[PDB]
Structures are given as C-alpha cells and as structure tokens.
Design a protein around this nucleic acid. Structure first.
Ligand SMILES: [Zn+2]
Ligand SMILES: [Zn+2]
Lengths: 268, 233, 639, 129
DNA sequence: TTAGAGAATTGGAGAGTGTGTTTTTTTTTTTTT
DNA sequence: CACACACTCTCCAATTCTCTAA
C-alpha cells in the first residue's frame, strides 16, 4: 500500500424537500445519478424540490493506491501500481506500508476529458472494487498462569537477560541494563521520571545496532531512528504541508511518538 | 367581510411540518422553563439573563441535565440533532423573549456540553452524519473570522416585494419563488445586506491528539467549523 | 410622503413612557383622515402611514394617555378604524395581477404589525372603560354622538380581531401564545369580554347583536368545540405525557420506514454493477426485460421504479385545507372555555333570536347567516360536550332552523355550481352550513339519550318532521352527485361522510323502531329503497377517495367509511360496483401496510370483497376487464 | 501567534496617508459584500469584508505641523523669547535622568539638527548630527 | 342523465441564442554552517 | 476560431370548458 485517502461519503439515498411547502421525498441512486423530482407532489410548483444534503443518506468510500510487491517485481523494473476502492467496513482496515492480498472485481470506468464536458476518453481507467482484504505481513489466563510461577522460578532475572538478543555474543551487563530499561520504574505523582536511559559505545561493526533493532522489534510503542540528519523519521517535531492534501500537519518526532516506550537512537 | 372569505389571502405558506422536530421544540422549551437547580430557582432562566447583552448569543446547556429531564427527549436530540437544531434555537428564542426588551432581529443559539460518550477522529464515519457527537483534537491552524450569511432578505426586482428569512444551503441561495403568489419571477432578486442576518464564522483544522493516534499512522486531520459565541475560543 | 411626515411629526413624541401631544393634534389628525379619504386606489397613504408606524408610535399612546380629551379621542378612534380597515375591504378582492397584489400584501403586513402592537392591555382597558361608562347610560339617553361611538369602538375591536396571521410568524408551535392568543388575553385582562357578554344578554342593546356575533366569531376563530370543552385543571400532566408518547410513536414509525428502505436497497453501493434478464417478462418490445436496478428490487419489482410522476394540470389540482390546527395557549384556552360556558348559559338564546330577527327583517350584510350557522355549530357542539342541557340552546332546536340551514345549503350548492369564479368560497359557506346541519342532527340523538321525557317527545316531533319532508333526505344525494375534489377540501368530504353516516343511523333506527310509512300528496317509503339511491358510482367513488387517506383519517371517519361500504356490499349485494382497479390498488396498500393490525375492520372488509371478486373471477375471466372502468347496471350483468 | 489582518480602501485625498510599516489608527465603515471565491473556498456563504476608510492617523505623528494651532505657534514663539531657553531645552532631554548634562546637550543638538547644504549644486554635505 | 361536438387555455417540443475551454532556475537572505 | 452546455422564447396540438343531442 502506497497511500490511503480520506473518508469519502458516497450518497445512497437523496433527500429532497420543497422550498415552497416543505413537502419531502426520497430518491434512490441509479448507478451514480439522481432522478431529481422536477415537480412537487403536495403542491405543484416546478423546480421547487431542493436536495437537503445532510438529510440524505451516505456510506463510506475510500481510495487506496497499491504497488506491486518488491518480491514480485521483475529484475530492475520500476513498480506497477493499481487503484483500489473500498466501501463500508473494508475502508478503515488497511494503512500505508501494509502488504495485502486484495480480492476484488476488476472494474473499468470512463474518464471525462474535462470536468464540464461529458465527452470521455476512449482509453478507460481501471480500478478494483475491494471484496476482501488479507494482510500478509502481520508477522489471558493461559499466559498469566505460566508467568506467575515463572516469576518465582530461581534466577529468572538471568534467564530473561540471557533471552535478550540470542543472535549476538553475550554482554551480560548490557543485556541486564536493557532488561531493566524495558521494565522501567514506577510512575507516580512528583515529576520524577520512571524512564531509564541507556547509552552504548563502541566501534562501527559492533553488535550495538543489532541490539537496537532487536529491542525495537520487541517492545510496544517503540521507535528506531538515526541521529544523523538523513534519518527516515526525525527525532524533533516539525510542521509540514501534507502533500496529498496541502494542509498543515504537525509531525511529532520519534521522541514524542514513543511517549510510553523505548526510543532507539542509532548513530547518536 | 365574511367567515368564508379566507382563501389563503396573500401567502405562499409552508404546510407540511416536521412533527418530531416540533415536538423537540415544544419539549425543549418545557425543559428550559421547568428544569431547576439543586437549590431550585430554575436554572437556564438565570443563565438566559446574560443574553440581553450585546455580543452574547449562545446558551450552553448540560446534556446530563437534559437526560435527567427526560431520557427520550435527550435520545431524540442526540439522534436527530442537526435536523432539530434550528427548532431548539427557536425554542430558546421563545424562551428568552419573556424579557420583552430583547432586540427582535437578534439570533440565539443552543450549545451542548457534558455529552457522556466521546468519539475518535477515526470513528467519524458517515453513520455519524447529523448526530450529536463529542471529539477530542489538537488545533493545528485557525483561519480568520468571517461573517456568514445565515438568512438573506431579498427584493424582487420586477414587483418590489421583499422576501425575508431565505435560509442558506452550502451555496449562496436566492428565493426559489417570489413571495407574491401571482408574480412569475424566479431568478431576478437583489440581496439587502443591511436587513439580512449574519453569523460569525471560523474554520479550524485539527488532528488526532497524541494519545489517540494509532501506532504507525499518519495523523488524520479534520476540519471544524466554529460559529457565533465559539469563534476564536 | 413629506407632507405626511410633517403631520406625523406634528402629532407629538414619546419620552420614556409618557406621550407629549402637540396642541395642533386635532387639525393634524383631521388632515390625516383627509389624506386617507383622498387615497389612491393603490392605498398609498395606507402604506405610507403603516410604514411610518404612527398607529404604534402616536395613536396608541394618545388613546391610552389622553383619553380624557374627548374630541381628540373620537378623532383618533375614527382614524384608527380607518387604518385598521381590512385589506379585503380596502381592495375589494384579492387582486389578480402583481402590482395590486404587492400593494395588498403591504397593507396586510402593516395590519399584522397593528395586531402585534394592539396586544397591550392598556389599550383594551381604555376601550372597555369608555364603552362601560357609555353603556352605563340608558338607551333613550343615547344620541348619534354615543351610538356612533359604540359602532366605531366595536368596529375597531372587530378590525383588530379580523386580521390574518402573518405567514412568516404562523409557524408557532402548539401550546404557545400566538399574536391572536395574546390579543385574546388582552381582551380577557381588560374585561371587554364581560362587556361583550353584557351586550349579548341585553334586551335593550339588541341593536348591536350582529356586531357582537362577529366579535365572538373572530374570537373563537381557531378553536374546536369538543377539544375546548375538554379543558380543565389537570391538563398539564395529560398534555405533557401525550406529547412524550406521540414523540415516541413518530420516532418508531420513522425507524420502521428507514429499515424497510434499507432492505429495499441492497448492502452494496449503487455503482456496484450487474444486469439480469427476466425471461418471462416481455419488455415494451418483444424482447425480454433487462433489469439494471439491482437484484434487491426484483423482490417487489414494479415497472414504475424509475418513472417521474406527472404534473397535475392547474385545473385538476385538488383543493387543500387552508390551515393546520395548533393547540393554543392553555391560559387562553381556559379563558375561552369560561367565556363559552358563561355565554352559552347567559347570552346564547337571546343573541341567536336577535340575529334571526335581523336576518328576517333583512337589515344585515350579504353573508351574515354564515356567522349565524357558525354560532349554531360551535355552541351546540360545546353544549353537547361536557354537561349537555337543551334549555341552553332551545331557541335553535326548532324545525325552522333545520329549514333555514337546508335552504342556505341548497343556495350555496347552486351558487357554487353556477358562480364558478368563487366556487371555493361558496364551498366554504356550504361547509359551514353542513356543519350546522350535522350539529342539529347530533343534538337530537343527544336528546334521545337524555333522560327527560319532554325532550324525548320534542325529539320525536322534530325527527318525524325532518324525515317526513323530502329535502332533508335528498340533500345528501345531491351533495354526493356533484361533489368535486377540484373545488371542495377533504375536510368537507370527511364532514359529509360522517353526517351521512349519522343521518342514516338515525333514519334506520327510526324505521326499525316503528313503521311510519307515509312520506313527502304523500307516498309510501322504506329505508332499503332509500339506500338503493346510494348505489350510484359517484357516491362510492367519493367514499373510496376519502378512504385513500385512511392512514391520516380519524378512527370514527374510517368506521363511517367501512360501515357504509359494508352496508352497500353485505346488505345490498352491490360488490360489483366496488370491484374496481383503483380501489384494488388501495386494498393492495391496505394489505401491505405494516400497521395493518391497527385497521382490522378495513382489511377484513377488503379481504371479504377480494374473496368475492376472486370467486367471480374463477367462474368468469371477463371480470378482470370489468375492473378497469366505473359502471352502471353492469353491476347486475356481472352477476 | 500569527497576526490577523484587514483590507482597507482609501479614496480621494486619503490616498498616501500611510506607507508599509506605518503604525496607524483607522476610522472607517466596516463593510461586507458577497464573494463567490470565498464561498467556494469555504463551502459556506462567507462574505468578504473590507474597511471603507474615513480617517487615517499615524500613531507616530500624533502632532503634525498642520495640526499646530495659532495658540500652539504663539506659545512656541513666545517661549523662544525666554533668553534662557537653551538651558531649558537641554534640561528637557530625558528629565528622569540625573546628571549627564553633556549627553543631554549633545542629544538636544542632534535632535534639532543642522541644515543640509549643496554649494554650486555639485558638492553635498549632510546636515544631520 | 350521459356524453359528444366546437372553442379556449395550458403543456411541452424544439428552434434559437449566448458562454467557456488547452517540477525548474537564478537570486536574495537568514541561519547555520 | 468550435464544439458542448445552459437558458429563453415561440409555436403547435392535446386537454379541458362550454353548449347541445341521444
Ligand atoms: Zn411543494
Ligand atoms: Zn415578485
């Protein structure tokens, strides 16, 4: 998924009211166009029925822009992309960056040459009406009962610390410190931080970055970013024009996004 | 002349009436006239005292007080809020008019606080259109206050008849017909800006608060419209 | 304009709450009266003085604070009567062209403004006090000076009560004080109501009977007798609970309709495609129907799913009821109930006798019998409501009133059919006559129920007279056979049907109780051959026309309709008259109604006649063609 | 916080009553008219607003030379005849500062200023201190 | 009592008139380099 | 420029009113 639009309301039933006598009627949607009443029924005035927008009925719609997977692209080619349209409950189930198997009906629709003229291009636009989404990159008492006795097992501290990052050769006190950072103190109120701050030092080519990436994959509300100015997501907060909308958005940095977690800062 | 000489003399009048909205008007006026504080004395009658002042036009009502008055009335208002809102405003005008010293051209607005349920920005789907809703958000940008036309007074140019209280859609709207029943004019009308009624208007962008933002998402922004007493607050 | 401005300035000015009149008020007021008398036909001075608001700013303060200055007071009263002159009198009629209609609307607007201003109790207090100290003198002590002042005072009150409600501010919701309600409250607090009761009950001042009748008519313009008679101490709780219950009923109906529409459309968006061929259904050509409006619609398919309805042309547009009913302020309703009670007990007989004397002597305006018939309907209905006492209305119970009402109703019927340019006005006058006739026919039933053998005797006498004379029987058929939806409202049709039901109820019970064979140079009679006159197509056409609004009809009205149709079907065996396609569409709606359980009588009658039709159809397939048209004696050929 | 702003129309001899950067007081009619551009920008029938200026007064120039009345110039000319006016003018420079008489003298001389000169139209010399 | 032939009024088909359109580079300036 | 929309006016004929015969 490359982008996901704002929620688009699609009219399902138009509500008309007579501006002369307040008599109301309802019109059903015929393949995207309204059969507007040209006359009122109670009275008989012509062109008196006005569309009451917020008494009409609407349903959710959303546009999604979906790129072919990197694992599926042919060698050295720029990726292809399709447009999906989801409606009702399937609208708010997919975010940008997700990988999905989408089942839907492959539609083809005309596009008018300019908005005030009904001539259409011979070459049709295509999109997929979404019928089903399946995410394919996602990866209680029965746990509490295990954890209660495992907590009173001997040297559970050492067991958890050694469980941290099995893929690297062991630095006992580093792993112990990261474990105590994960658990943290107790937050109470005055103003004292329960958060624990840890710093790792060493040459490039040490296991410090592997530790950072591991615990970022582990912890909830985690973040991973570089102190270098070329980082994917910044540490500080900033304001930017949302390019697909042009309206301002306050992008709070990783330190604010990790307000109840661990912020991993590589190249500090 | 005679009891039978009354054929609808000189009016193009509206004859279908929104029964639910008018029941809301009547029962909300009863609520304002009868609901009383912990020490009695009719709350909202005392708070209507300040509406005599210039640049005060909004009465803020507690939705839990409305619920205590009657569950069905509060449920109806919550479900059909945008439908019944001008009728609640007319009820407030009828309530405030017991002072007898009010400027009659003045508009009055009902505002609601202490709504029990809160909704996320992600939950503002089409099912919530027209319903009374409470949201939390962080203001990102506020635009200038403008005067918005709420009801235009128009002059019919080819019979000189004045049409009052032409209510505005999301488009600037002239009279659909002339108020003179035999006049055939339907597009030649002139707005009288001095005799029309305006409201203070301000639009603000908000986004999801830091607490409510789902993990990994871009912040979802929303456009909010503030009116009358609420602008620049 | 400027000269009027100068004189209006010369009247004086208000300061805080006290008006300081100039010494030249008399000549300036005479000049204003002169300008009004020398008006253009457009009534320019009327419009200009209304725009200047001198009635609100000068004349009411002068009237209320300098009423001891008698020449100025008399001049102001005459000027105010002139200014408050109703617009229909000002222009003669409703103008047919835009310019005079704009001027009419201007004068009407300023009249509505005057009515808004006149709700102050001080003005009516001064009017009541001056009328009281005038009427304190004996009639023989009066001269033209005082008699003309009584005329001008009562005409001012009449003019202010007559004014139509503004279309802008007639949107008041029930239980609220409209401008008319506030005006009636001003009359109540000033005590002019008691003076009106005195004028109605006085034998000496009978000369003002027509005036007082018009005041009372315009006072009780909006009210309904039974609804008003039901008012009392404990009404606030009743009306509050009723409002909450009706709110919930309306909400449940809207929810049910929303669910039905949500099922009728699918759970897929409208641009979700798909097309079907309905193989059995031939299209307008010979090819099979191609359906595009979604599979959900084919459960209750109809060919008119996407069709625009037709513009009813101006001539065929049905008549619509002129006003909605609103429950007026409770204080005003209590005051009007007390007024009506005291008036009925103390005033009504003498006032109605005086008005009948005026109509006999022919010293009344052209249509004052409409006020007479209004008073009959309203006050006899109020009498029967609550404590019925026929002594309070015994001046009305004579057969002469039946004869007078029947003559007026036939006259209005003829004039409606002939004077086509105000046929609706003649229909309204005929509606008043019909309601008066209905109330007499209801009152004799109440006399039968009442315990007094004397009123039972006189009830028998009047029933014998009415059922003997032919016009009372033939008038219902005459009305049905030339009723027109184009001209007469559905409220009239309701009243006609209910009056016919009550009349046939009484006549059937009378003939069932005893023979009484001779009727009309007399001839024999029986109720079955009378009922056979109601077997015409036009009357049943009108009855089903009223039946179409069964959702909005009252339960009593629905009972009247279904009882008459059951009488024609079950007892006269005229089901083929009612075998009709439009009537079958109405039955289709009745059977498909979600609230069909609330209409158990109607659906049972519909299923009875439908079963009879399908039996006949199984025997003979030409009945399907017979459904398509109204008929005469094919009612027997089908049989 | 971002500042609010208004358009104002200056007509006839009110033009060039001010320049960009001037602090002003503006008396005028607050006027509104329909603007389809604002209506389509906002989605609601919003009316454009402008001030029809009647009087512009720079908050800088609370007193202009044109504002001086015959009483004012009579006061000034008669006060100049005191013959101790130089000491009075020097003392009036920052009256809440003790001492610094040389500073007050220099600032008075700079505040009143000299005259620019251009002998022969080809050699300009400044008059400001 | 129904309905059909002649005259007048209203619905709307269609003929005629007017309106709107098809990332890039050099330079400055403040802050940050 | 020129090809679609948007709007008004006019004429034509189809429906309803009025008067007469079956
Ligand atoms: Zn209508
Ligand atoms: Zn007009």
């Amino acid at each position: 998924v490359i982008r996901t639009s704002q929620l688009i309301p699609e009219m399902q039933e138009a509500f008309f009211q007579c501006q002369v006598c307040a008599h109301t009627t309802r019109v059903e949607m015929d393949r995207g166009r309204i059969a507007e009443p040209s006359v009122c029924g109670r009275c008989h005035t012509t062109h008196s029925m006005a569309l009451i927008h917020n008494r009409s009925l609407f349903s959710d719609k959303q546009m999604i822009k979906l790129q072919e997977s990197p694992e599926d692209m042919p060698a050295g080619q720029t990726p292809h992309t399709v447009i999906l349209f989801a409606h009702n409950d399937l609208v708010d189930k997919v975010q940008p960056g997700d990988r999905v198997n989408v089942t839907g009906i492959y539609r083809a629709v005309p596009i008018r040459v300019n908005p005030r003229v009904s001539n259409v291009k011979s070459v049709y636009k295509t999109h997929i009406d979404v019928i089903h989404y399946r995410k394919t990159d996602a990866k209680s008492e029965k746990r509490v009962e295990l954890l209660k006795e495992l907590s009173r097992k001997p040297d559970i501290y050492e067991r958890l610390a050694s469980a941290l990052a099995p893929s690297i050769y062991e630095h006992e006190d580093i792993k112990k410190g990261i474990l105590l950072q994960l658990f943290g103190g107790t937050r109470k109120d005055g103003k004292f931080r329960a958060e624990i701050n840890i710093l790792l030092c060493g040459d490039p080519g040490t296991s410090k970055s592997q530790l950072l990436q591991y615990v970022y994959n582990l912890v909830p509300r985690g973040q991973y970013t570089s102190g270098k100015g070329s980082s994917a997501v910044g540490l500080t907060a900033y304001v930017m024009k949302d390019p697909e909308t042009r309206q301002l958005v306050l992008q709070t940095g990783a330190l604010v996004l990790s307000d109840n977690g661990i912020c991993c800062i590589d190249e500090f | 002349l005679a009891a039978a000489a009354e054929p609808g003399a000189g009016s193009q009048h509206l004859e279908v009436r929104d029964e639910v909205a008018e029941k809301c008007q009547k029962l909300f006026l009863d609520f304002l006239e009868e609901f009383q504080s912990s020490d009695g004395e009719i709350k909202y009658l005392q708070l209507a005292e300040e509406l005599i002042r210039p640049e005060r036009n909004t009465l803020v009502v507690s939705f839990v007080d409305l619920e205590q008055f009657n569950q069905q009335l509060s449920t109806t208002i919550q479900e059909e809020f945008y439908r019944v809102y001008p009728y609640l405003c007319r009820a407030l005008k009828t309530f405030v008019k017991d002072r007898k010293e009010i400027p009659l051209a003045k508009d009055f607005y009902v505002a609601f606080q202490d709504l029990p349920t809160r909704h996320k920005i992600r939950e503002l789907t089409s099912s919530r259109i027209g319903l009374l809703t409470r949201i939390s958000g962080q203001v990102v940008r506020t635009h200038p206050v403008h005067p918005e036309l709420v009801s235009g007074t128009f002059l019919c140019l080819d019979c000189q008849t004045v049409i009052r209280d032409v209510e505005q859609q999301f488009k600037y709207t002239q009279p659909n017909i002339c108020r003179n029943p035999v006049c055939a004019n339907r597009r030649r009308f002139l707005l009288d800006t001095n005799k029309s009624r305006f409201v203070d208007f301000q639009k603000v962008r908000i986004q999801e608060t830091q607490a409510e933002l789902p993990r990994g998402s871009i912040p979802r922004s929303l456009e909010v419209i503030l009116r009358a007493e609420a602008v620049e607050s | 304009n400027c000269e009027l401005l100068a004189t209006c300035s010369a009247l004086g000015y208000l300061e805080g709450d006290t008006y300081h009149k100039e010494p030249d008020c008399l000549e300036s007021v005479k000049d204003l009266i002169r300008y009004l008398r020398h008006e253009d036909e457009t009534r320019d001075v009327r419009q200009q003085l209304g725009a200047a608001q001198i009635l609100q700013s000068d004349l009411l303060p002068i009237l209320t604070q300098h009423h001891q200055d008698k020449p100025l007071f008399d001049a102001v009263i005459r000027l105010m009567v002139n200014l408050t002159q109703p617009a229909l009198l000002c222009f003669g009629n409703l103008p047919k062209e835009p310019s005079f209609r704009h001027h009419f609307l201007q004068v009407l607007t300023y009249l509505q403004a005057y009515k808004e201003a006149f709700a102050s109790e001080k003005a009516f207090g001064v009017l009541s006090e001056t009328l009281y100290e005038l009427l304190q003198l004996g009639w023989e002590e009066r001269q033209e000076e005082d008699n003309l002042l009584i005329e001008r005072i009562l005409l001012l009150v009449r003019n202010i009560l007559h004014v139509p409600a503004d279309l802008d501010q007639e949107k008041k919701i029930d239980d609220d004080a409209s401008a008319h309600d506030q005006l009636l409250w001003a009359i109540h607090l000033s005590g002019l109501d008691d003076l009106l009761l005195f004028l109605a009950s006085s034998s000496a001042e009978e000369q003002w009977s027509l005036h007082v009748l018009e005041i009372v008519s315009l006072m009780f313009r909006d009210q309904n007798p039974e609804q008003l008679a039901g008012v009392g101490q404990g009404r606030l709780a009743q009306e509050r609970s009723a409002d909450f219950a009706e709110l919930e009923v309306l909400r449940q109906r809207e929810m049910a309709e929303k669910k039905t529409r949500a099922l009728q459309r699918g759970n897929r968006h409208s641009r979700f495609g798909g097309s079907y061929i309905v193989q059995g259904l031939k299209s307008i050509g010979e090819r099979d129907l191609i359906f595009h409006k979604g599979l959900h619609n084919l459960r209750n398919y109809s060919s008119d799913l996407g069709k625009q309805p037709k513009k009813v042309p101006k001539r065929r547009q049905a008549a619509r009821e002129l006003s909605i009913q609103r429950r007026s302020a409770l204080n005003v309703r209590l005051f009007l109930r007390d007024f009506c009670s005291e008036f009925l007990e103390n005033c009504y007989n003498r006032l109605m006798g005086s008005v009948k004397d005026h109509l006999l002597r022919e010293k009344a305006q052209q249509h004052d019998e409409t006020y007479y018939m209004w008073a009959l309907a309203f006050f006899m209905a109020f009498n029967r409501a609550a404590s019925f006492r026929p002594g309070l209305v015994s001046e009305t119970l004579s057969v002469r009133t039946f004869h007078f009402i029947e003559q007026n109703l036939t006259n209005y019927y003829e004039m409606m059919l002939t004077d086509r340019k105000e046929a609706a006005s003649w229909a309204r006058r005929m509606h008043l006559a019909l309601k008066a006739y209905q109330e007499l026919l209801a009152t004799v039933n109440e006399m039968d129920i009442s315990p007094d053998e004397a009123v039972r005797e006189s009830s028998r006498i009047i029933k014998n007279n009415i059922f003997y004379v032919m016009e009372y029987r033939e008038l219902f058929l005459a009305l049905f056979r030339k009723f027109d939806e184009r001209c007469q409202p559905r409220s009239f049709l309701r009243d006609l049907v209910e009056t016919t039901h009550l009349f046939l109820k009484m006549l059937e019970r009378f003939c069932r109780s005893r023979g009484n064979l001779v009727v009309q140079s007399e001839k024999e009679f029986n109720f079955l051959d009378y009922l056979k006159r109601f077997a015409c197509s036009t009357v049943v056409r009108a009855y089903v026309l009223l039946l179409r609004s069964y959702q909005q009809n009252s339960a009593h009205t629905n009972h009247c309709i279904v009882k008459m149709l059951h009488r024609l079907a079950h007892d006269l065996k005229m089901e083929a008259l009612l075998f009709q396609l439009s009537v079958f569409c109405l039955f289709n709606r009745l059977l498909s109604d979600p609230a069909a359980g609330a209409y158990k009588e109607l659906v049972t009658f519909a299923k009875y006649i439908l079963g009879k039709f399908f039996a006949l159809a199984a025997v003979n397939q030409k009945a399907f063609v017979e459904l398509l048209f109204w008929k005469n004696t094919a009612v027997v050929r089908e049989m | 916080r971002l500042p609010r702003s208004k358009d104002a129309i200056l007509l006839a001899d009110l033009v060039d009553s001010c320049k960009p950067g001037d602090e002003i007081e503006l008396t005028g009619i607050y006027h509104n008219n329909y603007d389809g551009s604002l209506n389509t920008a906002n989605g609601f029938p919003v009316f454009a607003t402008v001030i029809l200026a009647n009087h512009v007064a720079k908050k800088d120039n609370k007193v202009a030379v044109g504002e001086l009345t015959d009483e004012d110039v009579k006061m000034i000319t008669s006060l100049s005849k005191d013959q101790q006016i130089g000491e009075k003018i020097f003392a009036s420079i920052a009256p809440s500062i003790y001492g610094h008489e040389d500073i007050k003298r220099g600032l008075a001389l700079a505040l009143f200023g000299g005259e620019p000169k251009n002998p022969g139209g080809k050699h300009k010399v400044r008059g400001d201190i």
